[PDB]
Amino acid sequence: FQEAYPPLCSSDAAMLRTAHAGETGADEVHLAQYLIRDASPLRGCLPL
Amino acid sequence: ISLTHQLRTGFHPGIAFTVVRQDRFATEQLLYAERASESYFVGQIQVHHHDAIGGVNFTLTQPRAHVDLGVGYTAVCATAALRCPLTDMGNTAQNLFFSRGGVPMLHDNVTESLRRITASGGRLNPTEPLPIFGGLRPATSAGIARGQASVCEFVAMPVSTDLQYFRTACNPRGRASGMLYMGDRDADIEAIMFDHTQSDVAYTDRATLNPWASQKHSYGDRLYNGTYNLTGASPIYSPCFKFFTPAEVNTNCNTLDRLLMEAKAVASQSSTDTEYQFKRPPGSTEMTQDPCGLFQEAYPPLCSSDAAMLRTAHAGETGADEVHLAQYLIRDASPLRGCLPL
Amino acid sequence: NTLNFVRFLELGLSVACICTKFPELAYVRDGVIQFEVQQPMIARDGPHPVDQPVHNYMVKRIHKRSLSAAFAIASEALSLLSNTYVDGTEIDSSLRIRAIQQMARNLRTVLDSFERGTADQLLGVLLEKAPPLSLLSPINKFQPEGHLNRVARAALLSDLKRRVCADMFFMTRHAREPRLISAYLSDMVSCTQPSVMVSRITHTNTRGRQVDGVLVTTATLKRQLLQGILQIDDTAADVPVTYGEMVLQGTNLVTALVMGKAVRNARVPADLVIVGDKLVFLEALERRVYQATRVAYPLIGNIDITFIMPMGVFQANSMDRYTRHAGDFSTVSEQDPRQFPPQGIFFYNKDGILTQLTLRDAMGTICHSSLLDVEATLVALRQQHLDRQCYFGVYVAEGTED
Amino acid sequence: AIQQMARNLRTVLDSFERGTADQLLGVLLEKAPPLSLLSPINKFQPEGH
Amino acid sequence: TFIMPMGVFQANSMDRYTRHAGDFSTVSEQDPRQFPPQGIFFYNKDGIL
Amino acid sequence: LNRVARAALLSDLKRRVCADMFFMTRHAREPRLISAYLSDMVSCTQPSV
Amino acid sequence: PAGIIPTGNVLSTIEVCAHRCIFDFFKQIRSDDNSLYSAQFDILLGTYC
């Protein structure tokens, strides 16, 4: 298909995790940083 | 020319638009028929001798005829499931430079530079040699990715528009119309469609939303109506053609039965195998059920004036705020509320 | 491979029609069929006029169609079939057997194609006949009898708008609730009036119960309705096999020539269900017919939906420019870049990609010369009733040297 | 003519048996108080006065 | 029968309270909600405001 | 098929192979889905002579 | 042309084309014409009451 999947990446380690003792964060853009949610086929695998 | 300068730079002129686009979807249907729904007559089979490229071609022809021997309605169908959409839900701007017939501007330099500027930043354009005694077909492209491009026609309106009109099933003309409102006389289709002495029929308070696309000879009515026939030479389909033209009417039947006759599988008014959604090709008989064409209405999709409002930070469903400061987010009111995943 | 032959009578779509042979069809100008239907009354008193009974005379006419099928022959086949008792040698005989073998093998499928396409023509005419259920069922219910005024008719029309907006994809939306699907299948079935009852032999099941219709779907919808929604009544059905031939002769023949007028089982494996209180066929004919042939299947029809979006509207009232919270969308700039009037609209694509319609896309429409075609408009407004008005604001004078 | 007159007379005689039910429905609707008022009258007050 | 008041201004100064600070804020220096109301907003038969 | 049917089909294949990729270790907790798509796998290939 | 036995023989064989202001329909075929060999007929398929 000549495409590529983006995984869970972010420009700041602060926003990549949330303070809830569980899943990771989901806020996409804070002021000028960014967080790209996982769109790869490995969504429910590869434990964090 | 000045409006070209303003729109190219980033200025906002004192005018607002509504976009209209038609989208096609593959559906699976379900039909039920009673027992003696048809008297189906079988004729006598005959053959035609016919010479061909190397030999002969035998054509076997058998005539037949059918009668609906039901006093009422003896068969009913209803669309059931949604398959993949055929069309692309994109942003391809309608070009009015495919049309010939209006009065030209005096200086041909201005018209050529204006067409050249409009061709920049757009997909479909007339070809550069300008074929006289031709159809002004736009130049074909390479292969396509996600379906047939759907054109979007722009209708102007005044800026101070009641935005709550666009959160439900509205009419692009700004004034609801159609044959459906009757009961007293014959020539009340024209009074509903164009007469502004009396108020609107649907929004039962005012004459019309935009007074630039609703009167008998307004700008939108002079531009898109088929009776005036301004865009006849344009080969591309106009998605707001069905909203502005008065339908031909015979008043012998009552309203509800003729509504049922208009509700059947009408012939399509677009092209399927082609790439830019052109006009209806002659000889093409494909029957498509057409909702929201017999009610003269269009549905607003999920749209917002900022990308920030359209999506939330929850890893799930979309945003839900109505207006933030001066922007807006119109929630989806189409029949495809829970389909077409995002 | 060996092709299988489909017989039109053995199909479950055969119950929806009465096929009769008619040799002299090509000489028929018009067909006429007549109805004489009467209606009852009740008697009342008070300020109501007494009623007289009504009789209705309805007349319908035939619609003539056709079926065409082609069949080709190579030139060498003609050459080796044009012998007529001249040959019989041992070299061209094999070629002649190959030619007549291709002849018979081709003619067999050509003869099969009519039996295969009669079902296609019934699907075509039944699609061209049937109104939508979302428009048939409220009219059959919400008006009691008819002859409505403006008001109840307008309320009915609003109900129809809501019903079309709601109940359009009800199979793929409420697929997690099987109780509703069997709840509107009986609404589909108990909404069509029946037809005439005159017949000699009918379609029945194994027990002998008379069938009541046919319900044709796609194969996937047949599977979904068959797995857990509807209940199987039988696996085999009794199907009539003969056509029924009528011819004109004698007094009818001499009338037609002079005046110009004229007057008048098998067991098949097919699954039957019961819906509501009626017994119907349920056929999803996709493997017997329309398989590995270049024709598209009906019941795969398309719909067109029109989408409308405002583009650059600015909310004029200062009441309506409110924020739900204080710090909703803050920016480092000293001036918040959201008070400004919007210039674009963001929607979603077919695949879910975010796209944008900027006002720069409007130059294909508003920057045309058609914005200055005021001449026909001026001609139209100059032909109506105008009153004598003061001309203070539209008149320009000249200086008079003072 | 005689067949039309007989076919007409049969429905006219049908109309009385069909309209007796209409008159019974008329008197029974004009004879019936609502449930939402009859039910608490016969429950809350013992006898009256 | 349905009933609705239109121009009622809550005269008591205690009664003009807000549930939160930034509930419906604006851009201007004076919010247009301390002013006395002049209209009423309700729903039509079809759900249109 | 023409251009547009092929294009919509390729978009469908792209989404399908992105989703239906590890369909036994994603939908492991649902025994109904595995027996549902095994019958899709088996009833998709043509027989032989 | 209907193949009906004529009820009476016509005498006085003269030129009939000249006196065509009489009669209500006059058709003069030269030798033969395919309009004679037309047999389009209308048919009734039964009534239902």
mmCIF file of C-alpha atoms in Angstrom, chain C residues 120-373:
data_model
loop_
_atom_site.group_PDB
_atom_site.id
_atom_site.type_symbol
_atom_site.label_atom_id
_atom_site.label_comp_id
_atom_site.label_asym_id
_atom_site.label_seq_id
_atom_site.Cartn_x
_atom_site.Cartn_y
_atom_site.Cartn_z
ATOM 1 C CA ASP C 120 -34.535 -10.151 -13.646
ATOM 2 C CA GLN C 121 -37.500 -8.543 -15.376
ATOM 3 C CA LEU C 122 -39.775 -9.212 -12.393
ATOM 4 C CA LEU C 123 -37.206 -7.617 -10.085
ATOM 5 C CA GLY C 124 -37.025 -4.631 -12.432
ATOM 6 C CA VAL C 125 -40.777 -4.090 -12.574
ATOM 7 C CA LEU C 126 -41.230 -4.692 -8.829
ATOM 8 C CA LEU C 127 -38.537 -2.118 -8.051
ATOM 9 C CA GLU C 128 -40.220 0.302 -10.447
ATOM 10 C CA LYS C 129 -43.581 -0.322 -8.736
ATOM 11 C CA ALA C 130 -42.988 -0.422 -4.968
ATOM 12 C CA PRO C 131 -43.239 2.776 -2.889
ATOM 13 C CA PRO C 132 -40.982 3.136 0.166
ATOM 14 C CA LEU C 133 -42.232 1.704 3.445
ATOM 15 C CA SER C 134 -41.384 4.915 5.328
ATOM 16 C CA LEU C 135 -43.894 6.713 3.089
ATOM 17 C CA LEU C 136 -46.418 3.903 2.634
ATOM 18 C CA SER C 137 -46.987 3.018 6.283
ATOM 19 C CA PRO C 138 -47.840 6.430 7.863
ATOM 20 C CA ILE C 139 -50.370 7.217 5.099
ATOM 21 C CA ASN C 140 -52.016 3.821 5.540
ATOM 22 C CA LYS C 141 -52.360 4.560 9.290
ATOM 23 C CA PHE C 142 -52.336 8.251 10.246
ATOM 24 C CA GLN C 143 -55.158 9.300 7.925
ATOM 25 C CA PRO C 144 -58.282 7.223 8.661
ATOM 26 C CA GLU C 145 -60.055 7.430 5.295
ATOM 27 C CA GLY C 146 -58.956 10.458 3.274
ATOM 28 C CA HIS C 147 -60.354 13.666 1.774
ATOM 29 C CA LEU C 148 -58.176 15.517 4.264
ATOM 30 C CA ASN C 149 -58.137 19.232 4.999
ATOM 31 C CA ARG C 150 -54.961 21.335 5.011
ATOM 32 C CA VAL C 151 -54.185 20.839 8.691
ATOM 33 C CA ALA C 152 -54.123 17.072 9.244
ATOM 34 C CA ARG C 153 -52.356 16.759 5.891
ATOM 35 C CA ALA C 154 -49.648 19.191 7.032
ATOM 36 C CA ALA C 155 -49.209 17.287 10.305
ATOM 37 C CA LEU C 156 -48.941 14.070 8.279
ATOM 38 C CA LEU C 157 -46.284 15.656 6.061
ATOM 39 C CA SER C 158 -44.237 16.665 9.110
ATOM 40 C CA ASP C 159 -44.555 13.095 10.422
ATOM 41 C CA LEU C 160 -43.297 11.847 7.049
ATOM 42 C CA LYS C 161 -40.260 14.142 7.226
ATOM 43 C CA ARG C 162 -39.379 12.840 10.693
ATOM 44 C CA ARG C 163 -39.953 9.217 9.633
ATOM 45 C CA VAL C 164 -37.673 9.497 6.593
ATOM 46 C CA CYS C 165 -34.997 11.240 8.680
ATOM 47 C CA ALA C 166 -35.214 8.512 11.351
ATOM 48 C CA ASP C 167 -36.140 5.150 9.782
ATOM 49 C CA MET C 168 -33.834 4.894 6.774
ATOM 50 C CA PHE C 169 -31.101 2.401 7.714
ATOM 51 C CA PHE C 170 -32.985 0.513 10.366
ATOM 52 C CA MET C 171 -31.450 -2.880 9.516
ATOM 53 C CA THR C 172 -27.813 -1.830 10.047
ATOM 54 C CA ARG C 173 -28.541 0.516 12.965
ATOM 55 C CA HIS C 174 -30.673 -1.622 15.277
ATOM 56 C CA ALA C 175 -28.918 -4.899 14.492
ATOM 57 C CA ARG C 176 -28.196 -5.503 18.190
ATOM 58 C CA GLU C 177 -31.947 -5.652 18.975
ATOM 59 C CA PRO C 178 -33.624 -8.556 17.117
ATOM 60 C CA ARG C 179 -37.006 -7.715 18.671
ATOM 61 C CA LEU C 180 -37.466 -4.607 16.514
ATOM 62 C CA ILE C 181 -36.576 -6.237 13.182
ATOM 63 C CA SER C 182 -39.359 -8.804 13.475
ATOM 64 C CA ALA C 183 -41.487 -5.906 14.729
ATOM 65 C CA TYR C 184 -41.288 -3.936 11.502
ATOM 66 C CA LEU C 185 -41.140 -6.918 9.142
ATOM 67 C CA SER C 186 -44.740 -7.595 10.155
ATOM 68 C CA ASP C 187 -45.352 -3.867 9.683
ATOM 69 C CA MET C 188 -43.985 -4.220 6.148
ATOM 70 C CA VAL C 189 -46.158 -7.249 5.429
ATOM 71 C CA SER C 190 -49.366 -5.962 7.045
ATOM 72 C CA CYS C 191 -49.381 -2.746 5.010
ATOM 73 C CA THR C 192 -50.003 -3.937 1.426
ATOM 74 C CA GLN C 193 -53.481 -4.750 0.219
ATOM 75 C CA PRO C 194 -53.961 -8.237 -1.265
ATOM 76 C CA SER C 195 -54.969 -8.985 -4.852
ATOM 77 C CA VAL C 196 -57.565 -11.103 -6.638
ATOM 78 C CA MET C 197 -58.121 -14.675 -5.462
ATOM 79 C CA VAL C 198 -59.132 -16.452 -8.688
ATOM 80 C CA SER C 199 -56.800 -19.365 -9.521
ATOM 81 C CA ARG C 200 -56.914 -23.126 -10.017
ATOM 82 C CA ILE C 201 -53.652 -24.388 -8.474
ATOM 83 C CA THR C 202 -51.566 -22.241 -6.128
ATOM 84 C CA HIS C 203 -48.259 -22.306 -4.259
ATOM 85 C CA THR C 204 -48.586 -24.301 -1.038
ATOM 86 C CA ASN C 205 -46.270 -25.843 1.524
ATOM 87 C CA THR C 206 -45.921 -29.493 2.545
ATOM 88 C CA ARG C 207 -48.828 -29.343 5.006
ATOM 89 C CA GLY C 208 -51.108 -27.630 2.499
ATOM 90 C CA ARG C 209 -51.192 -24.097 3.862
ATOM 91 C CA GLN C 210 -51.540 -21.461 1.152
ATOM 92 C CA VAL C 211 -48.579 -19.089 0.847
ATOM 93 C CA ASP C 212 -49.083 -15.320 0.997
ATOM 94 C CA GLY C 213 -46.159 -13.646 -0.756
ATOM 95 C CA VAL C 214 -42.449 -13.442 -1.488
ATOM 96 C CA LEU C 215 -39.778 -11.406 0.321
ATOM 97 C CA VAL C 216 -36.571 -10.879 -1.672
ATOM 98 C CA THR C 217 -33.335 -9.645 -0.067
ATOM 99 C CA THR C 218 -29.577 -9.709 -0.419
ATOM 100 C CA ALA C 219 -27.943 -12.972 0.693
ATOM 101 C CA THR C 220 -26.288 -11.323 3.711
ATOM 102 C CA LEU C 221 -29.637 -9.962 4.900
ATOM 103 C CA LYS C 222 -31.151 -13.404 4.296
ATOM 104 C CA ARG C 223 -28.485 -14.866 6.583
ATOM 105 C CA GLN C 224 -29.024 -12.213 9.262
ATOM 106 C CA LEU C 225 -32.821 -12.585 9.238
ATOM 107 C CA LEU C 226 -32.544 -16.369 9.056
ATOM 108 C CA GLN C 227 -30.070 -17.030 11.874
ATOM 109 C CA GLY C 228 -32.023 -15.661 14.828
ATOM 110 C CA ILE C 229 -34.936 -13.407 13.883
ATOM 111 C CA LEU C 230 -37.587 -15.318 11.931
ATOM 112 C CA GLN C 231 -38.853 -18.868 12.397
ATOM 113 C CA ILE C 232 -38.610 -21.614 9.776
ATOM 114 C CA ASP C 233 -41.973 -23.020 8.713
ATOM 115 C CA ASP C 234 -40.875 -25.571 6.098
ATOM 116 C CA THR C 235 -37.971 -26.540 3.844
ATOM 117 C CA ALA C 236 -39.960 -27.757 0.810
ATOM 118 C CA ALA C 237 -42.770 -26.107 -1.135
ATOM 119 C CA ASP C 238 -45.395 -27.195 -3.658
ATOM 120 C CA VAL C 239 -45.038 -25.282 -6.922
ATOM 121 C CA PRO C 240 -47.266 -25.271 -10.037
ATOM 122 C CA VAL C 241 -45.391 -26.172 -13.192
ATOM 123 C CA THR C 242 -47.607 -25.397 -16.215
ATOM 124 C CA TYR C 243 -48.220 -21.984 -17.777
ATOM 125 C CA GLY C 244 -51.832 -21.760 -18.911
ATOM 126 C CA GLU C 245 -52.446 -21.108 -22.602
ATOM 127 C CA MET C 246 -55.329 -19.198 -24.136
ATOM 128 C CA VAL C 247 -55.991 -18.517 -27.821
ATOM 129 C CA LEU C 248 -58.572 -16.569 -29.806
ATOM 130 C CA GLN C 249 -60.788 -18.417 -32.281
ATOM 131 C CA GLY C 250 -64.221 -18.399 -33.879
ATOM 132 C CA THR C 251 -66.435 -15.467 -32.949
ATOM 133 C CA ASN C 252 -63.522 -13.784 -31.175
ATOM 134 C CA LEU C 253 -61.375 -14.191 -34.299
ATOM 135 C CA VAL C 254 -63.989 -12.710 -36.630
ATOM 136 C CA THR C 255 -64.643 -9.884 -34.145
ATOM 137 C CA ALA C 256 -60.916 -9.095 -33.987
ATOM 138 C CA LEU C 257 -60.558 -9.149 -37.771
ATOM 139 C CA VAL C 258 -63.666 -7.101 -38.599
ATOM 140 C CA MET C 259 -64.514 -4.762 -35.702
ATOM 141 C CA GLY C 260 -61.061 -4.442 -34.150
ATOM 142 C CA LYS C 261 -61.884 -5.563 -30.597
ATOM 143 C CA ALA C 262 -61.605 -8.748 -28.545
ATOM 144 C CA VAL C 263 -62.482 -10.088 -25.092
ATOM 145 C CA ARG C 264 -61.473 -13.096 -23.027
ATOM 146 C CA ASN C 265 -47.797 -29.768 -8.769
ATOM 147 C CA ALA C 266 -44.080 -30.178 -8.119
ATOM 148 C CA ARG C 267 -42.005 -30.264 -4.944
ATOM 149 C CA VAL C 268 -39.208 -27.683 -4.920
ATOM 150 C CA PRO C 269 -36.545 -27.194 -2.207
ATOM 151 C CA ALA C 270 -37.034 -23.603 -1.067
ATOM 152 C CA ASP C 271 -37.186 -22.191 2.446
ATOM 153 C CA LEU C 272 -40.382 -20.612 3.791
ATOM 154 C CA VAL C 273 -40.769 -18.486 6.918
ATOM 155 C CA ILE C 274 -43.731 -16.979 8.743
ATOM 156 C CA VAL C 275 -43.749 -13.282 9.647
ATOM 157 C CA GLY C 276 -46.579 -11.622 11.551
ATOM 158 C CA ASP C 277 -49.409 -14.059 10.859
ATOM 159 C CA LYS C 278 -48.665 -14.677 7.163
ATOM 160 C CA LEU C 279 -46.574 -17.355 5.460
ATOM 161 C CA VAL C 280 -44.122 -15.977 2.893
ATOM 162 C CA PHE C 281 -41.317 -17.182 0.681
ATOM 163 C CA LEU C 282 -37.855 -15.814 1.454
ATOM 164 C CA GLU C 283 -35.524 -15.881 -1.553
ATOM 165 C CA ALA C 284 -32.095 -14.259 -1.905
ATOM 166 C CA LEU C 285 -31.503 -15.364 -5.475
ATOM 167 C CA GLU C 286 -27.823 -14.593 -6.079
ATOM 168 C CA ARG C 287 -26.194 -17.992 -6.687
ATOM 169 C CA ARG C 288 -28.821 -19.454 -9.022
ATOM 170 C CA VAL C 289 -29.020 -16.246 -11.080
ATOM 171 C CA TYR C 290 -26.605 -13.276 -11.397
ATOM 172 C CA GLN C 291 -23.595 -15.505 -10.655
ATOM 173 C CA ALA C 292 -20.446 -15.061 -12.780
ATOM 174 C CA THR C 293 -22.346 -12.969 -15.325
ATOM 175 C CA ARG C 294 -21.665 -9.362 -16.208
ATOM 176 C CA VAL C 295 -25.004 -7.937 -15.004
ATOM 177 C CA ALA C 296 -25.306 -6.043 -11.734
ATOM 178 C CA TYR C 297 -27.708 -7.240 -9.079
ATOM 179 C CA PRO C 298 -30.756 -5.110 -8.204
ATOM 180 C CA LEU C 299 -31.550 -4.431 -4.519
ATOM 181 C CA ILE C 300 -28.073 -2.813 -4.491
ATOM 182 C CA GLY C 301 -29.624 0.554 -5.255
ATOM 183 C CA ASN C 302 -28.057 3.902 -4.462
ATOM 184 C CA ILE C 303 -29.288 6.922 -2.522
ATOM 185 C CA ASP C 304 -28.283 10.574 -2.781
ATOM 186 C CA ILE C 305 -27.972 12.721 0.347
ATOM 187 C CA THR C 306 -27.387 16.480 0.131
ATOM 188 C CA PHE C 307 -25.209 18.195 2.744
ATOM 189 C CA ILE C 308 -25.366 21.907 3.597
ATOM 190 C CA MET C 309 -22.899 23.938 5.693
ATOM 191 C CA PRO C 310 -22.706 27.668 6.441
ATOM 192 C CA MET C 311 -19.277 29.031 5.719
ATOM 193 C CA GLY C 312 -18.475 32.494 7.049
ATOM 194 C CA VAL C 313 -21.499 33.590 9.057
ATOM 195 C CA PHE C 314 -20.735 35.915 11.970
ATOM 196 C CA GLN C 315 -23.140 35.906 14.917
ATOM 197 C CA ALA C 316 -24.328 39.508 15.021
ATOM 198 C CA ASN C 317 -25.982 39.570 18.446
ATOM 199 C CA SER C 318 -23.633 40.263 21.349
ATOM 200 C CA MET C 319 -25.799 37.968 23.476
ATOM 201 C CA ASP C 320 -24.926 34.982 21.294
ATOM 202 C CA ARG C 321 -21.134 35.466 21.488
ATOM 203 C CA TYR C 322 -20.732 33.719 24.842
ATOM 204 C CA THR C 323 -18.184 31.276 26.249
ATOM 205 C CA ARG C 324 -19.231 28.323 28.396
ATOM 206 C CA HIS C 325 -16.117 28.622 30.577
ATOM 207 C CA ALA C 326 -13.493 31.232 31.387
ATOM 208 C CA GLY C 327 -10.275 29.549 30.278
ATOM 209 C CA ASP C 328 -11.561 27.408 27.421
ATOM 210 C CA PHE C 329 -9.075 28.124 24.604
ATOM 211 C CA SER C 330 -6.390 30.514 25.822
ATOM 212 C CA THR C 331 -3.499 31.749 23.700
ATOM 213 C CA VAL C 332 -0.191 33.451 24.582
ATOM 214 C CA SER C 333 -1.143 36.450 22.400
ATOM 215 C CA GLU C 334 -2.444 39.612 24.056
ATOM 216 C CA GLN C 335 -5.517 39.494 21.783
ATOM 217 C CA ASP C 336 -7.538 36.287 21.636
ATOM 218 C CA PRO C 337 -7.671 35.123 17.968
ATOM 219 C CA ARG C 338 -11.240 33.845 18.207
ATOM 220 C CA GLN C 339 -13.170 37.118 18.536
ATOM 221 C CA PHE C 340 -12.424 37.674 14.842
ATOM 222 C CA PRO C 341 -15.070 36.642 12.283
ATOM 223 C CA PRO C 342 -14.589 33.086 11.012
ATOM 224 C CA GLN C 343 -13.376 32.554 7.468
ATOM 225 C CA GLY C 344 -13.473 28.770 7.023
ATOM 226 C CA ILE C 345 -15.403 25.611 7.809
ATOM 227 C CA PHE C 346 -13.907 22.258 8.848
ATOM 228 C CA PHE C 347 -15.683 18.973 8.139
ATOM 229 C CA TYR C 348 -14.754 15.300 7.777
ATOM 230 C CA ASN C 349 -13.887 13.335 4.644
ATOM 231 C CA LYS C 350 -15.063 9.854 3.629
ATOM 232 C CA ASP C 351 -12.083 8.177 5.331
ATOM 233 C CA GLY C 352 -12.157 10.467 8.365
ATOM 234 C CA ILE C 353 -9.440 12.851 7.168
ATOM 235 C CA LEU C 354 -9.979 16.422 8.312
ATOM 236 C CA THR C 355 -10.441 18.819 5.386
ATOM 237 C CA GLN C 356 -11.102 22.540 5.048
ATOM 238 C CA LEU C 357 -13.227 24.840 2.882
ATOM 239 C CA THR C 358 -11.581 28.276 2.899
ATOM 240 C CA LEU C 359 -13.217 31.359 1.334
ATOM 241 C CA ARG C 360 -10.456 31.251 -1.312
ATOM 242 C CA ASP C 361 -12.448 28.371 -2.833
ATOM 243 C CA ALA C 362 -15.321 30.761 -3.612
ATOM 244 C CA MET C 363 -13.520 32.624 -6.423
ATOM 245 C CA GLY C 364 -14.753 30.019 -8.879
ATOM 246 C CA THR C 365 -18.305 31.232 -8.260
ATOM 247 C CA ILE C 366 -18.393 34.813 -6.993
ATOM 248 C CA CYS C 367 -15.548 36.128 -9.197
ATOM 249 C CA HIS C 368 -17.396 35.358 -12.441
ATOM 250 C CA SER C 369 -18.984 37.851 -14.813
ATOM 251 C CA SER C 370 -22.387 36.395 -13.864
ATOM 252 C CA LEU C 371 -22.420 38.695 -10.823
ATOM 253 C CA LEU C 372 -22.999 41.581 -13.272
ATOM 254 C CA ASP C 373 -25.876 40.269 -15.410
#
